[model samples]
Target: PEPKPGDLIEIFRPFYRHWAIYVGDGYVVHLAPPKAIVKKELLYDVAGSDKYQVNNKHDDKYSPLPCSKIIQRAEELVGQEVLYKLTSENCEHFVNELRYGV
Candidate 1:
């Protein structure tokens, strides 16, 4: 299925789930390694692993902002520095904030 803007793409890792927001044209906005800041790139390129899925698990849990706004928020966050932390602020947290504006 073709992913729309603001769609969550979940990448499976050995220990935890990774996430990225689809920003259209097969590119995704996600927290990149090393810098830990948000980075936009080809979806598969960012996967870094073999298995992945697209999930809407958070939709029912949180009121979604407008798609345009979500994309805008993602774009605004790209290249901005963020402290990466598991069990707190991480890729999932980043995409959640973009979706719900929290």
Candidate 2:
């Protein structure tokens, strides 16, 4: 089933490109591609970056669904040190509760 308003999204899919956090009511924000470009209120045009394949990466097949589902899943992952996970700990510390993981 697709994610809900408070769903925690664990992105173990392919491409390893984008990650989004959903806030319900049709509001979803995600990275454009390369998992670096950030866009808000993003709807439709859920395409990945040129660097990563839309479905396959590292010889692994992954299918990232709609932006809503993707964001919702990330939202659910909030408060679980998700920022740290997302940032890959390149940052000294986790960004705010849900702001910057940089």
Candidate 3:
């Protein structure tokens, strides 16, 4: 079944990083986990009707996912929510600041 408006979703990506958000019309926009880069876009719909990405121009034989996996992952996330805590700034910055003084 198609998700109704305001449904919650959590998305898992290539490296097992996850993101969560409320569903909008044909897209999943939310705070990207770990990195926390704010990005949004319409991705895909279950039952294969509405997909945000198609005809990938960079598809090759050895790539992980040339096409968008939104349909596959979005379906898995329709009704679940999770909270992620992120430390401000990159961890490496802290290490360098204290250790190397640069």
Candidate 4:
């Protein structure tokens, strides 16, 4: 699907998918690993050979934050890495928290 502003972008890879939030201008904020410094890069660069979807699985279940807020939050965290845990600190969790309010 073509991306919309503030959409959660899930990039499909061989065994797993990486998660990111579209912040506009073809840029997305993703937790680039090997320390996972939250980085903002072009969707093409991140998606590479994989296809991606603008997945907002929780939109029916919860209200989404406004695009301004989601985009602002993502930009504020650029150049930063984060601590991780399977239960809470995963990349999906990060984008979800910005898109939804969870």
Report the number of the highest-TM-score candidate: 4
Q: List where candidate 4 sits over 4 angstroms from the true fold.
A: 85-89
Q: TM-score for each prediction?
A: 0.85, 0.31, 0.31, 0.89
Comparing 1 with 2 on lDDT, the higher-scoring candidate is 1
Residue pairs with colliding backbones in model 4 are 37-81, 38-80
Question: Per-residue lDDT tens digits of candidate 4, residues 1-102?
Answer: 558889998888777878888888888988876545888899989999997898898899799998898988889988876766532237788889889866
| Model 1 spans > 4 angstroms off | 86-89
RMSD of 4: 2.1
What is the TM-score (0 to 1) of candidate 4? 0.89
Cα RMSDs, all models: 2.0, 10.6, 14.7, 2.1
Query: What is the per-residue lDDT of model 1 for residues 5-102, given as tens digits with 9 covering 90 to 100?
Result: 88888888777777888988888998866546778899878776558878767788788899999888898878887675644246677788887787
Q: Write the per-residue lDDT of candidate 2 for residues 4-102, one digit (tens) a residue.
A: 442222333353434344446654444333434444443233422232122112113333355455444445544332222345222112112233221
Reference-based TM-score, model 3:
0.31
Clashes within 3 Å, all models in order? 0, 4, 1, 2
Q: Rate residue 82 of model 1 by lDDT.
A: 68
Q: Residues 22-65, candidate 3: write the lDDT tens digits.
A: 23466654444432343344545321242222221222432322
Count backbone clashes in candidate 1: 0
> What is the Cα-based lDDT of residue 97 in candidate 1?
80
Quantify all predictions' global Cα lDDT against the true fold. Answer: 0.79, 0.36, 0.34, 0.83
